[PDB]
Design a protein around this ligand. Structure first.
Ligand SMILES: Cc1nc(-c2ccncc2)sc1CN
Ligand SMILES: Cc1nc(-c2ccncc2)sc1CN
Ligand SMILES: N[C@H](CCC(=O)O)C(=O)O
Ligand SMILES: N[C@H](CCC(=O)O)C(=O)O
Ligand SMILES: [Cl-]
Lengths: 255, 255
């Protein structure tokens, strides 16, 4: 319904490239300013106060770039900092949590369906996803903090016994067999097939992808046509070495 | 001299602090973990160098007479720059470990394996220091994933064993000495000894070089401090993240 060209994308590091990939594939925006807090990544192992402050400082970064909409690609910042970012900023901020709730409403008509939330420690300890799902009447929601997937994925460990063992470590205690599996972390789309293949091979579920969900939400909220910019302009900024972050983008975006 | 600072990226430095407290050589210790920004090991030298200079600003109001850089990554990359901007002595954990090796490894051809973060290994600080002393049979191995595994309190079981098998299977030189060039690795020291004993059938394990024990000897000799003097040293904990969170980990790491 609303109007809204130049976009910002905030993430703790290179994980947000999974959201940038969705944005770029949808071809909805012509200019995107990506900022990864790669000097301080990860956020998910840290405390709400630290993370909330990180989100507010991300706003200070974007202020000189005259963006019209800020996407918080980071599920951790979305879960912990979004409300504070919203109150301190004059521009719209859309996180990757709320859009996934809407996507589930649209894709999961069984309100009793087992749902499994995967995320960082901070995301899962916030109960952000559980609360929002309960508010929408879902009654059978489990959560699981798969902290070590982040560093594993960042070391390009996308297969093998070390990934399979880490999944065993985290998934084995699960009680309910999920019918929905929320990838509530920027990183986890890069192992989505393995996560689907684990729950199927040790007992596929509807995998909710945060990037795809935020894209669909933005089309509805702002009436944005796909294929409206064939080559969007993406600028990369980082608190750490920007060349390191741009080189990672080359890998994450061709994946 | 009397009141010292201890700097680490986070809670790993408790391995060095544990050594310092057991030796009972200092009366007052100001520990500072940059837990908002940990880890350093996956980041770039420029970022890490700046982290080291900012740590110096933290200790300025505390009026310390000595700063221990417990972090091997900051020691490898930031120590020299830190010292140039500092009016007090700064001691890292790399150079003292070379001295412990000079003292314990008379065979300069003994195979030595240095373990540390990617940034530490990439700096080659250990290899360069060891070469400078006549040690020719030297290998370096970045074991990045040990850090997040240890912080998740995974000090045993199959996930850790698979991770050691991931990093060690490629080793060409069966080491006689393993340098624990990372604050976290002492917590799996016995596991590292156990691995080599199993997968290479030895009776005695490699010599393990503990960074904290190395710096303790160095400091007692350098400042001629009396071991077992202060029976209950004073330790103040500060963090860039939630200091209660850092103090809770300290309880576990110091046990
Ligand atoms: C698909 C893709 N798109 C990229 C891009 C787009 C816009 N601006 C910068 C980079 S890279 C890439 C493959 N690695
Ligand atoms: C468990 C433990 N905790 C120590 C401590 C804590 C805080 N301040 C000073 C010393 S020592 C120790 C065992 N040796
Ligand atoms: N971006 C974070 C994952 C990496 C981190 O811990 O910062 C998230 O989506 O939860
Ligand atoms: N303290 C670091 C390990 C953790 C980090 O990477 O920050 C070291 O000694 O190498
Ligand atoms: Cl650099």
């Amino acid at each position: 319904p609303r109007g809204s060209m130049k976009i910002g994308v905030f993430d703790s590091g290179v994980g947000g490239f999974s959201v940038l990939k969705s944005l770029l594939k949808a071809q909805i925006f012509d200019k995107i300013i990506y900022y990864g807090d790669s000097a301080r990544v990860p956020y998910g192992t840290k405390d709400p106060t630290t993370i909330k402050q990180f989100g507010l400082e991300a706003l200070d970064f974007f202020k000189p770039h005259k963006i019209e909409l800020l996407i918080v690609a980071c599920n951790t910042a979305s879960a912990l900092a979004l409300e504070e970012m919203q109150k301190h900023s004059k521009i719209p901020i859309v996180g990757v949590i709320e859009p996934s709730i809407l996507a589930i409403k649209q894709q999961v008509k069984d309100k009793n369906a087992p749902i499994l939330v995967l995320g960082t420690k901070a995301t899962i300890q916030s109960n952000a996803y559980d609360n929002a799902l309960k508010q929408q009447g879902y009654l059978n929601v489990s959560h699981l903090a798969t902290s070590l997937f982040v560093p594993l994925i960042e070391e390009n460990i996308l297969e093998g016994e070390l990934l399979e063992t880490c999944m065993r470590y985290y998934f084995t205690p699960l009680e309910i067999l999920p019918e929905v599996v929320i990838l509530g972390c920027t990183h986890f789309p890069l192992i989505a097939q393995k996560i689907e293949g684990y729950f199927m091979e040790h007992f596929p579920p509807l995998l909710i992808h945060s990037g795809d969900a935020i894209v669909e939400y933005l089309q509805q909220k702002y009436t944005l046509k796909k294929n409206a910019c064939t080559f969007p302009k993406v600028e990369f900024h980082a608190s750490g070495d920007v060349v390191w972050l741009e080189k990672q983008a080359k890998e994450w975006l061709k994946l």
